[PDB]
Structure formats: structure tokens, C-alpha cells
Design a protein around this motif. Structure first.
Motif, mmCIF file in Angstrom:
data_model
loop_
_atom_site.group_PDB
_atom_site.id
_atom_site.type_symbol
_atom_site.label_atom_id
_atom_site.label_comp_id
_atom_site.label_asym_id
_atom_site.label_seq_id
_atom_site.Cartn_x
_atom_site.Cartn_y
_atom_site.Cartn_z
ATOM 1 N N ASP A 1 0.972 -1.221 0.015
ATOM 2 C CA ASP A 1 0.173 0.025 -0.012
ATOM 3 C C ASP A 1 0.852 1.214 -0.029
ATOM 4 N N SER A 2 0.185 2.359 -0.468
ATOM 5 C CA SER A 2 1.048 3.636 -0.427
ATOM 6 C C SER A 2 0.338 4.624 0.755
ATOM 7 N N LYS A 3 1.062 4.940 1.715
ATOM 8 C CA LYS A 3 0.876 5.915 2.676
ATOM 9 C C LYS A 3 1.890 6.892 3.262
ATOM 10 N N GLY A 4 1.517 7.563 4.142
ATOM 11 C CA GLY A 4 2.472 8.422 4.614
ATOM 12 C C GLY A 4 2.588 8.631 6.290
ATOM 13 N N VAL B 1 5.527 22.094 7.427
ATOM 14 C CA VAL B 1 5.844 21.006 6.707
ATOM 15 C C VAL B 1 5.895 20.986 5.049
ATOM 16 N N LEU B 2 4.849 21.918 4.723
ATOM 17 C CA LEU B 2 4.816 22.239 3.351
ATOM 18 C C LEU B 2 6.101 23.352 2.767
ATOM 19 N N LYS B 3 6.571 24.194 3.608
ATOM 20 C CA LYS B 3 7.658 25.044 3.286
ATOM 21 C C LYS B 3 8.947 24.181 3.239
ATOM 22 N N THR C 1 1.999 6.811 11.521
ATOM 23 C CA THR C 1 1.301 6.403 10.247
ATOM 24 C C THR C 1 -0.004 7.188 10.231
ATOM 25 N N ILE C 2 -0.456 7.535 9.032
ATOM 26 C CA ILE C 2 -1.657 8.222 8.912
ATOM 27 C C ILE C 2 -2.639 7.191 8.587
ATOM 28 N N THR C 3 -3.751 7.041 9.759
ATOM 29 C CA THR C 3 -4.822 6.250 9.336
ATOM 30 C C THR C 3 -6.060 6.997 9.730
ATOM 31 N N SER D 1 -1.001 16.660 10.068
ATOM 32 C CA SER D 1 -0.188 17.634 9.107
ATOM 33 C C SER D 1 -0.317 16.834 7.899
ATOM 34 N N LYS D 2 -0.017 17.588 6.618
ATOM 35 C CA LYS D 2 0.319 17.079 5.475
ATOM 36 C C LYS D 2 1.475 16.107 5.512
ATOM 37 N N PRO D 3 1.495 14.920 4.902
ATOM 38 C CA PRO D 3 2.691 13.940 5.275
ATOM 39 C C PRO D 3 4.115 14.623 4.960
ATOM 40 N N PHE D 4 4.937 14.544 5.860
ATOM 41 C CA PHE D 4 6.261 14.782 5.658
ATOM 42 C C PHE D 4 7.110 13.819 5.176
ATOM 43 N N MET D 5 6.631 12.439 4.912
ATOM 44 C CA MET D 5 7.319 11.270 4.609
ATOM 45 C C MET D 5 6.346 10.385 3.960
ATOM 46 N N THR E 1 -2.087 19.937 -7.978
ATOM 47 C CA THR E 1 -0.580 19.630 -7.180
ATOM 48 C C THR E 1 -0.843 20.501 -6.071
ATOM 49 N N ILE E 2 -0.469 19.924 -4.866
ATOM 50 C CA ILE E 2 -0.445 20.531 -3.579
ATOM 51 C C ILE E 2 0.731 21.505 -3.511
ATOM 52 N N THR E 3 0.699 22.894 -3.463
ATOM 53 C CA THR E 3 1.827 23.775 -3.155
ATOM 54 C C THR E 3 1.629 24.621 -1.968
ATOM 55 N N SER F 1 -7.196 18.402 0.822
ATOM 56 C CA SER F 1 -7.544 17.243 1.260
ATOM 57 C C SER F 1 -6.240 16.614 1.544
ATOM 58 N N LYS F 2 -6.117 15.502 2.109
ATOM 59 C CA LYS F 2 -4.806 14.518 2.279
ATOM 60 C C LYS F 2 -4.900 14.069 0.803
ATOM 61 N N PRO F 3 -3.517 13.839 0.517
ATOM 62 C CA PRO F 3 -3.146 13.366 -0.994
ATOM 63 C C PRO F 3 -3.963 12.101 -1.409
ATOM 64 N N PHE F 4 -4.629 12.017 -2.340
ATOM 65 C CA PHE F 4 -5.144 10.810 -3.061
ATOM 66 C C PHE F 4 -4.207 10.336 -3.891
ATOM 67 N N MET F 5 -3.171 10.788 -4.461
ATOM 68 C CA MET F 5 -2.160 10.283 -5.354
ATOM 69 C C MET F 5 -0.656 11.131 -5.026
ATOM 70 N N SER F 6 0.265 10.244 -5.376
ATOM 71 C CA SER F 6 1.691 10.733 -5.182
ATOM 72 C C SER F 6 2.212 11.063 -6.229
HETATM 73 C C1 LIG Z 1 3.042 18.405 -0.775
HETATM 74 C C2 LIG Z 1 3.962 17.914 0.381
HETATM 75 C C3 LIG Z 1 3.829 18.982 1.816
HETATM 76 S S1 LIG Z 1 3.595 16.310 0.828
HETATM 77 O O1 LIG Z 1 3.210 15.714 -0.371
HETATM 78 O O2 LIG Z 1 2.479 16.381 1.446
HETATM 79 N N1 LIG Z 1 4.804 15.757 1.462
HETATM 80 C C4 LIG Z 1 5.973 15.160 0.886
HETATM 81 C C5 LIG Z 1 6.333 13.728 1.104
HETATM 82 C C6 LIG Z 1 7.640 13.479 0.496
HETATM 83 C C7 LIG Z 1 5.344 13.005 0.733
HETATM 84 C C8 LIG Z 1 4.830 13.203 -0.563
HETATM 85 C C9 LIG Z 1 3.850 12.191 -1.132
HETATM 86 C C10 LIG Z 1 3.056 11.417 -0.270
HETATM 87 C C11 LIG Z 1 2.128 10.540 -0.343
HETATM 88 C C12 LIG Z 1 1.689 9.526 0.221
HETATM 89 C C13 LIG Z 1 0.466 8.777 -0.148
HETATM 90 C C14 LIG Z 1 -0.382 9.318 -0.976
HETATM 91 C C15 LIG Z 1 -1.666 8.554 -1.618
HETATM 92 C C16 LIG Z 1 -1.228 7.348 -2.312
HETATM 93 C C17 LIG Z 1 -2.132 8.224 -0.496
HETATM 94 N N2 LIG Z 1 -2.414 9.398 0.455
HETATM 95 S S2 LIG Z 1 -2.621 9.293 2.125
HETATM 96 O O3 LIG Z 1 -1.965 10.592 2.773
HETATM 97 O O4 LIG Z 1 -1.217 8.431 2.599
HETATM 98 C C18 LIG Z 1 -3.813 8.872 2.664
HETATM 99 C C19 LIG Z 1 -3.942 8.934 4.106
HETATM 100 C C20 LIG Z 1 -4.859 9.558 1.763
HETATM 101 C C21 LIG Z 1 -0.029 10.458 -1.619
HETATM 102 C C22 LIG Z 1 1.043 11.162 -1.486
HETATM 103 C C23 LIG Z 1 3.588 11.417 1.240
HETATM 104 C C24 LIG Z 1 4.558 12.283 1.494
#
Ligand SMILES: CC(C)S(=O)(=O)NC[C@H](C)c1ccc(-c2ccc([C@@H](C)CNS(=O)(=O)C(C)C)cc2)cc1
Ligand SMILES: C=C(C)[C@H]1CN[C@H](C(=O)O)[C@H]1CC(=O)O
Lengths: 51, 51, 51, 85, 51, 85
Positions: free
Chosen positions: A5-8, A27-29, B17-19, B29-33, E17-19, E29-34
């Protein structure tokens, strides 16, 4: 193989806390400035003992 | 998460981990990893050239 | 030598290499997040590329 | 012409404040917006950082609806931090 | 983003794109795609080598 | 502990002036020295640039022996320029 799976990860703050939005913007900056990347490379790879 | 809900800690910085279940009670917060569930095994010996 | 030429790898293996060579032109969209990323970026390679 | 530090800060705080005034009562929502405009008009050494970063943060965390004047008056003296990164 | 801010649209669903600049004006919203900035070129062809 | 901008500038000018007061008649010679010490005491975002660069240049170009007071009083309002470069 790949990932199942893909998460963060993330910084957690109590709902309705005053710190939440500042932390998020931080975190964004850090993300755009490449601080997060440089940090991971610092801790994970740069000192990496394998090869 | 518990320390955050019950106000024993103002903020949480850790590989948390974000759940959905955690996102319901707390703010993330927006994911840092970025990561994912992956498989780890013991590296095999060289298969040798063979014939 | 010819068969090593076929066996030759890595014409471009990274973003940095584009910055290092003027032979291959490269670009982004007229607007959008990528161009702005390159514009606002203070980290060396991407800066050079923007210039 | 020539760019400054102090001038940029005083301008930053004033432009942010004057901006948030149009948004009175929804003020706590628009702080980043008005900070964006203020960074644009007053300029910034680093586009990401903005004219004054510390003032922005202080306002964002302090400001409550209709509490603007007091919030700005408290936050306008705050250190802006490093306008590099 | 504009349609959202000026209230011509209630929600935005698109490859947005999140900026930081966007996170300041609107809410993401939390990212739905990376994704990430990547490099695209023309794949070479080894076909029909001949005698 | 943020160093702001304005605090650093006012500190810079004040330390430079106060230092140059110690050298009477040699004021135009020691400007760079006192700017060095002042940058040290007040800190700088870029060690090369110093606390306020524009003020330093202004003093160096303006200040003549025994002319210290007026020169400083004229130069302390000047724009400092880019603190990061
Ligand atoms: C724009 C930046 C602040 S960032 O993208 O948030 N963080 C940068 C960091 C390297 C990063 C970048 C991208 C992701 C990331 C991880 C997962 C996903 C999708 C597949 C699921 N999103 S989610 O948040 O885990 C979920 C629970 C919906 C989308 C993006 C996680 C971390
Ligand atoms: C496809 C387009 C024009 C959009 C999609 N994401 C980026 C955005 O969110 O602006 C743009 C592409 C880019 O900037 O490379």
C-alpha cells in the motif's frame, strides 16, 4: 518487490489546537525547500554502510 | 494519540502512520514522509554462473 | 568494442546531467506547478536549469 | 531601487493588517491570504519566506474572529526570523 | 482555485498539485495520489540491424 | 531565538558608531574594523554581508576625519540591501 500500500507519516496535533496550521505550513515549506529530502538522505543514505 | 486526546502532550512528532481512525480523533499535518508496507528477507548467495 | 557500445548505459541518469550538458534542450509547461517549482527553487541544480 | 529590511517589515505588518480589515469577522481564515498579498506588494528576499515570516506565524496562531486589532498590535513587534530560508 | 475562492465552485477535483502558495489560499485534502517532477525522452530503437 | 531585521540593523549602526567614536580623527580609517566588530556583536544572516551592508558602504564613502557624528547621522537611515547575498 514493491509496496503493498501507499501511505505516509505525519505530525499530529489535537483537534482545535492553535499549533496545527503553523505546523502544517511548516511541513509544506520544508517540503518545497527540499529540507525533508536532505534530512532523509542525511539519516538514511549518506552515511550508509552498504556499498 | 492517547496523550494527544487527553491533553498530556501538545504535539506529536514521530513516524506516526496516517490512518482514518487516527484522523477522526486527531489532526494530521500533510505527510512529511512517504512509505508503504513492504517485504524484507535475507539476501541470498550468488546463484553462480551455471552451464 | 561495438558490442560494448550496445552494452553502454546511462545516456542521462539524472536531472543533474541535464544541467551539465547544453546539447539536449529541455523544458516544462508554460505555467503550472512545475515551472513555478523551478522559478521559486533556491537549490543549485534546479536553479541552474531555470536560468 | 534599493531593498531594505526594516522598511520591508513595517510595510509587511501594515499591509497584512490593512488587508485583514476587509475580511473582518472571518479574519482568522484569511491571514495567509493577506500575508501573500503583503509579500507581493512589499517584496521578499525569498519568495517562500515572505516579507515577515514570524509575524505571519504569530498572527496565524493568535488571531481569533473580531480580535484582529489586539492581535496585530501584539504581533507586529515580533521577530520576523531569517528572511533567507 | 479562483472558482473556489470567489465562490463559483464548492469543490475542486482534478490533478491539482499541492503547493504552499495554494495551501495558503485554499484547503487541501490529504493527498489521494503521489507524484513528482520527472524527465521524459524518446526511447531509442535497436530494431532491424541488418547484415 | 530569531534575529529579526530591524533589531539587527539598529544594533549594527549603533555598534559601528559607538566603536568609531573611540577612534578620534582616524574615523575614516577604522570604519571597516568597527563594521567587522559590529557584525560580530550583532550577528549576520550572511557572514560576508554583515549586519547592514549599505550602511557600511555609506559610512566608508561619506565619513571623513572628525566628521563622524554628521556622517553617521546621515548614514543610519540608509537601506541595508540584501542581507542574504
Ligand atoms: C506536498 C507535500 C507537503 S507532501 O506531499 O504532503 N509531503 C512530501 C512527502 C515526500 C510526501 C509526498 C507524498 C506522499 C503521499 C503518500 C501517499 C499518497 C496517496 C497514495 C495516499 N495518501 S495518504 O495521505 O497516505 C492517505 C492517508 C490519503 C499520496 C502522497 C507522502 C509524503
Ligand atoms: C497538467 C497540468 C497543466 C497541471 C497538473 N498538475 C500541475 C499543477 O497542479 O499545476 C500542472 C502540470 C505541471 O505544472 O507540470
Amino acid at each position: 518487490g514493491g509496496n503493498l500500500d501507499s501511505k505516509g507519516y505525519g505530525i499530529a496535533t489535537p483537534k482545535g489546537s492553535s499549533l496545527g496550521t503553523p505546523v502544517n505550513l511548516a511541513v509544506l515549506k520544508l517540503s518545497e525547500q527540499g529540507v525533508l529530502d536532505k534530512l532523509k538522505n542525511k539519516w538514511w543514505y549518506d552515511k550508509g554502510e552498504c556499498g | 494519540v492517547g496523550e494527544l486526546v487527553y491533553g498530556k502532550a501538545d504535539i506529536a512528532i514521530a513516524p506516526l502512520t496516517i490512518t482514518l481512525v487516527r484522523e477522526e480523533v486527531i489532526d494530521f499535518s500533510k505527510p512529511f514522509m512517504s512509505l508503504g508496507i513492504s517485504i524484507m528477507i535475507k539476501k541470498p548467495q550468488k546463484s553462480k554462473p551455471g552451464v | 568494442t561495438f558490442l560494448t557500445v550496445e552494452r553502454m548505459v546511462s545516456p542521462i541518469e539524472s536531472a543533474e546531467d541535464l544541467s551539465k550538458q547544453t546539447e539536449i534542450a529541455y523544458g516544462t509547461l508554460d505555467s503550472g506547478s512545475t515551472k513555478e517549482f523551478f522559478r521559486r527553487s533556491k537549490i543549485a541544480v534546479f536553479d541552474k536549469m531555470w536560468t | 531601487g534599493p531593498a531594505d529590511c526594516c522598511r520591508m517589515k513595517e510595510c509587511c505588518t501594515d499591509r497584512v493588517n490593512e488587508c485583514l480589515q476587509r475580511y473582518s469577522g472571518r479574519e482568522d481564515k484569511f491571514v495567509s491570504f493577506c500575508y501573500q498579498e503583503a509579500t507581493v506588494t512589499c517584496g521578499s528576499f525569498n519568495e517562500i519566506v515572505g516579507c515577515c515570516y514570524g509575524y505571519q506565524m504569530c498572527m496565524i496562531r493568535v488571531v481569533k474572529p473580531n480580535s484582529l486589532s489586539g492581535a496585530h498590535e501584539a504581533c507586529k513587534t515580533v521577530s520576523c526570523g531569517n528572511p533567507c530560508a
